[PDB]
């Protein structure tokens, strides 16, 4: 996603006295440069969604996100000439449209084309920067994009010397509120069309070059184009600050059943498209590839293919509207990006296993791995925060006591749990009370008069009575109460 925020304010209509040729307004120079950029992105970066919001007094989006670069290439030549330069409104609008269309996680490079004539006040960049930084409030500064952005500024105003007379610090600081993810670009020289061409070439090579990679599954190999370009990732800012990238050669390191992988936490979905190095279909079409085979086999079989992106990294190479392709994810860089898979460097082929863990009939599966220490909701913790929980526990212990001596083991287990929690929390008075209710239910014993049941409840009541003293008779935590024979 790229939003080409191009200024259209009256400041950009100033003719520049270029030597030799006729007089070109800076709007025309920006049009030529952006035309080169759009042509390159439509030839070698076709899968890229781009949009062109213009800003002045008010920002308006003439073309929403689209892959149809023939639409944008004509929008650059059918432009109005609104006046008044105001940047904060432009950035707010760009944030709004990006969050409306894509969301908050997909990056959005912002090729902004200013003029080095920020403004005069009110809506000007200087007034907003000097005030809103210490003001913020509801109208917070939009420069810190709420997503992994990258602010490029084609400040096409001669060399730095021309813009340094009045204002370049405002712009280069404006970059910095984006956490430094950006770069100021200036056209060094007498604003010749060759120089603007060179500057836009610099921008193109910096940001809009595809990430070619060689996919290798053992010995079978193919050359791919991982769109979008992979964003560098940082483990932390204290123990490892240097960002890590993905290796150029993605080495496939096995295959995992799709039901085993569940839905893994990915970093960014990435398409993989084979690249040749009606000719595209008549020459490259008839040559057997690898990516086609891998995608077809994955779709038919229904599995994934782990990929060793590099030291300590890992990915996944799965298959798929009715259309399908080979989109590859990226896991969190770390030893065990998937907790239900074990430390990913501890995965080995089924051959090295004793038996076939997946089964002769393909029924068993070692995945997923149960945790070493069981959590709370699966175990039996004893919460007594609200009175409801304690009342529920005591009601359960009373009800099962009625069913004595049928469910004697369950009753004694629950009573042992209650006692353990009692000495754990020092709720000794609670234990005395529960002994009193045990005696009470003894008094309301039914006419059945089961002999063993009476003995068990009397023994339990005596046990709670002696434990309610607090002395080291049964106060030991491991001293679980045992029913009488």
């Amino acid at each position: 996603p790229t939003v080409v925020v191009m200024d259209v304010s009256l400041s950009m209509t100033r003719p520049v006295s270029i030597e030799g040729s006729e007089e070109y307004q800076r709007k025309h120079l920006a049009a030529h440069g952006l035309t080169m950029l759009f042509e390159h992105m439509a030839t070698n970066y076709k899968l890229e969604f781009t949009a062109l919001v213009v800003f002045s007094s008010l920002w308006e989006l003439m073309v929403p996100f689209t892959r149809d670069y023939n639409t944008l290439q004509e929008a650059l030549s059918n432009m109005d000439d609104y006046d008044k330069t105001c940047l904060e409104s432009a950035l707010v609008g760009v944030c709004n449209i990006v969050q409306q269309e894509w969301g908050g996680a997909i990056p959005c490079q912002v090729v902004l084309v200013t003029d080095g004539c920020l403004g005069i006040g009110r809506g000007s960049l200087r007034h907003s920067l000097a005030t809103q930084n210490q003001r913020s409030e509801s109208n917070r500064f939009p420069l810190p994009f709420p997503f992994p952005s990258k602010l490029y500024i084609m400040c096409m105003a001669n060399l730095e010397e021309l813009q340094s007379t009045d204002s370049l610090e405002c712009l280069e600081r404006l970059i910095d509120l984006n956490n430094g993810e950006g770069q100021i670009f200036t056209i060094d020289g007498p604003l010749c069309l060759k120089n603007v061409q060179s500057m836009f070439g610099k921008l193109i090579d910096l940001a809009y070059t595809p990430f070619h990679a060689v996919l290798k599954c053992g010995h079978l190999t193919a050359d791919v184009q991982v769109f979008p370009r992979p964003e560098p990732f940082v483990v932390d800012e204290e123990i490892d600050p240097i960002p890590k990238v993905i290796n150029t050669d993605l080495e496939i390191v096995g295959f995992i059943d799709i039901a085993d992988i569940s839905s893994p936490p990915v970093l960014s979905r990435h398409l993989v498209l084979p690249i040749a190095l009606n000719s595209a279909n008549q020459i490259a079409g008839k040559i057997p590839n690898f990516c086609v085979l891998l995608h077809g086999s994955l779709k038919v079989e229904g599995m994934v293919a782990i990929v060793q992106l590099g030291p300590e990294w890992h990915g996944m190479l799965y298959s798929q509207k009715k259309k399908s392709n080979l989109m590859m994810s990226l896991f969190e860089p770390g030893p065990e990006p998937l907790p239900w898979l074990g430390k990913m460097a501890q995965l080995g082929p089924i051959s090295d296993a004793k038996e076939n863990p997946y089964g002769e009939d393909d029924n068993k599966s070692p995945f997923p791995l149960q945790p070493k220490n069981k959590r709370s909701y699966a175990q039996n913790v004893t919460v007594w925060i609200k009175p409801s929980g304690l009342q529920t526990d005591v009601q359960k212990i009373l009800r099962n006591a009625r069913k004595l001596p049928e469910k004697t083991q369950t009753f004694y287990k629950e009573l042992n749990r209650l006692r353990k929690a009692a000495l754990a929390f020092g709720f000794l008075d609670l234990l005395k009370g529960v002994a009193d209710m045990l005696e009470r239910e003894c008094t309301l014993l039914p006419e059945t008069a089961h002999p063993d049941a009476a003995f068990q409840l009397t023994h339990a009541a005596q046990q709670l009575k002696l434990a309610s003293t607090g002395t080291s008779e049964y106060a030991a935590y491991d001293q679980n109460i045992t029913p009488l024979h």
Binding site: F49, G104, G218, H219, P228, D236, E237, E238, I239, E251, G254, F255, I256, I258, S263, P264, P265, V266, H270, N281, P288, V292, S297, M303, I306, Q308, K323, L326, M327, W340, L341, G342, A345, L347, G348, P349, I350, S351, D352, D362, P368, L369, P371, N373, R375, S376, Y377, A378, V381, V383, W384, I385, A421, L423, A424, F425, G426, G433, M437, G470
Partner: protein
Amino acid sequence: MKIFSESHKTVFVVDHCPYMAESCRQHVEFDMLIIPLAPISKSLWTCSVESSMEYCRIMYDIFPFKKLVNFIVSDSGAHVLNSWTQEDQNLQELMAALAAVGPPNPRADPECCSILHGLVAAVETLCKITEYQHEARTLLMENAERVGNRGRIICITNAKSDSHVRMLEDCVQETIHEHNKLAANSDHLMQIQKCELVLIHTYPVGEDSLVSDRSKKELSPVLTSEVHSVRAGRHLATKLNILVQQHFDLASTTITNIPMYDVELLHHKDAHVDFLETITLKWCTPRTNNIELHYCTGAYRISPVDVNSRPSSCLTNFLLNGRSVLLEQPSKVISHMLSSHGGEIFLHVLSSSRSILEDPPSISEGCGGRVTDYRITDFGEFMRENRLTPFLDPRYKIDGSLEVPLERAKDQLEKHTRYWPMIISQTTIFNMQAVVPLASVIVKESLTEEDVLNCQKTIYNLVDMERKNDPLPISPKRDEQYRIMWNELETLVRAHINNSEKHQRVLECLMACRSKP
């Protein structure tokens, strides 16, 4: 932040003097079903201890690793109930230790001690290094300096006046300075950088709050005083719940519309960036096998706040039974999907906005898509033959070499693909069922003697078919087909000669048995 954030080190303390023995005037009504007993009120110590234990349970459920926590009951003596090792920050061990401590003594010696010993131990205990801190420090040899040991100290007590509160404020600041000075000279003790201080005070309901609430006040760049005050019972538990919610950047959830009441969960905040104080996601119908591999951008653990209540119990038992649950944020858009991966209920955060990678170029028009004889099913068998499985026993390869199993997987993949023709018409040895045992056996690292017999039988039947001139698959004279198939078999076996001497044995067996003109 990083692994060693200010939340990495929490050292609970609890008042344990005989002042912490009376009831909290919140007698409960545990008698539902003659004349019931007098209602019983939990002691202030019981309230504080149990609420702190609930704090710890939520901590453990949400952050099973990399977040340890101590427990220092402050009595006549100063006992630390568990060390920092991960094998000691377990809930039942804490329960056992507290049970061993026992209820506070009512009439032993009331004024003989105060909680200052607990605080000074907490700073003293906070000076140590976690096992993970040790690992990081040994990892960064000559660079183990940028490892912030900042922690946090939580204290519960019944202070008689604000003067005492300021008193232990000065006491903790002084002992922080002293411990920093002591650790400056020593090597096996880090220096505290930031130690956020919380001094929750509790009193029985109906009694005046002798200490008024106070805001943050940094008595040092290595301290942050945030002493609150709240009554015992449900108020104290809610205060500690708010503390855990606002300490580790937690957030709530209110999964509702459950066919059978509402349920509430705690999970890490970052799961709510999609919407951008409890969100109200609603349950949606769980389809059996509509789609399998969703697009999940975060797998955050969850922990119920009423773990043993009816709705939480029903929902979590259903989840741990295996089936997923698809929620839906409030035309509808499918969203966060619960699931149970072995007994750790995760909350996936799906993506419902337009995918920037939509309408991909058709694979029938890209390179390599205009060929319609791909070995898709044979590659499917190849895929099912290299599937992965974990290894909890690290074996030794040759001598002191504990092999990394993924290196084994990569080497096996390289072995299996030495000769893998890419389309059906390209090859003829692999399409013939006669070579199937040899095809599936020869690529292995070490063919066994039974495999030697199988491959000898396979080449024998290949020679028999050659003699009988049976019609081989078309995949150009009858003898030419046999010639090229022998050539393909020889090319395959010659490539795996270095695998083992048995491969060389079958190689010259082929050479002797081949009908080379």
